[PDB]
Design a protein around this ligand. Structure first.
Ligand SMILES: [Zn+2]
Length: 263
């Protein structure tokens, strides 16, 4: 229905999805000088079940891994969340070249890609109902910095062979996404929305400070996917990222103390 071309891109979504025009849209630019450290922000911790991974697919917008959220198996707790959230799926956004690709930016710096781990509050009984609440969904956002090749990320990349084209899907199991987390757990949080239509404003964002490193070759593997079906001309699935939206005056807090700015 929508896309990332010039006729159906972000600047054209609001015409079909009113929420695109909302006041709490994501992503946003992160300027450390305008972000306050909140000492009350507690740590977040996860308990994932690698056996919970179910499918990997290509919907022509990105590549997503779907997990079994029929019950509390892979949970996210702590941080600014009121209770535990179920892991439902993770997907990526990336650019055409290594110099850009992430949706959020930290002090002007863009990364090659951004990984979004999507969770939802069971208190709301159902993902659909949860989508209606401002804190219904929680998303762990991880940046991918080019550097050392990532071993665990390779497990995921290899599977891409099975879903080169749009509309494809295949089994994917025994993969624990926490294996991709950097050593640091410091994060930034604010309330926003899904970066793709309908752009619901039901997300509590947790962006980790330390990015995950991946090799240029590995990113190359990522860009090998196609945004078009099978009996169609090869169209590379690149640039599936949304530019920053207006921060307005939303509170953006940091769980860590940044020593460089004051005494
Ligand atoms: Zn996303």
């Amino acid at each position: 229905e929508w896309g990332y071309a010039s006729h159906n891109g972000p600047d054209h979504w609001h015409e079909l999805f009113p929420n695109a025009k909302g006041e709490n849209q994501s992503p946003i630019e992160l300027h450390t000088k305008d972000i306050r450290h909140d000492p009350s922000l507690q740590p977040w911790s996860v308990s994932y079940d690698g056996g919970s991974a179910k499918t990997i697919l290509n919907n022509g917008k990105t590549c997503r891994v779907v997990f079994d959220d029929t019950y509390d198996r892979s949970m996210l707790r702590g941080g600014p969340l009121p209770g535990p959230y179920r892991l439902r799926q993770f997907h990526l956004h990336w650019g055409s070249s290594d110099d850009h690709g992430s949706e959020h930016t930290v002090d002007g710096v863009k990364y090659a890609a951004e990984l979004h781990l999507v969770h939802w509050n069971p208190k709301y009984n159902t993902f659909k109902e949860a989508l209606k609440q401002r804190d219904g969904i929680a998303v762990i956002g991880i940046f991918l910095k080019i550097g050392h090749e990532n071993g665990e990320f390779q497990i995921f990349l290899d599977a891409l062979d099975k879903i080169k084209t749009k509309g494809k899907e295949a089994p994917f199991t025994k993969f624990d996404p926490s294996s991709l987390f950097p050593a640091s757990r410091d994060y930034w949080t604010y309330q926003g929305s899904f970066t793709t239509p309908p752009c619901e404003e039901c997300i509590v964002w947790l962006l980790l400070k330390e990015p995950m490193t991946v090799s240029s070759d590995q990113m190359a593997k990522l860009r090998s996917l196609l945004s078009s079906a099978e009996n169609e001309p090869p169209v590379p699935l690149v640039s599936n990222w949304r530019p920053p939206q207006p921060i307005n005056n939303r509170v953006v807090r940091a769980s860590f103390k940044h020593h460089h700015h004051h005494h």
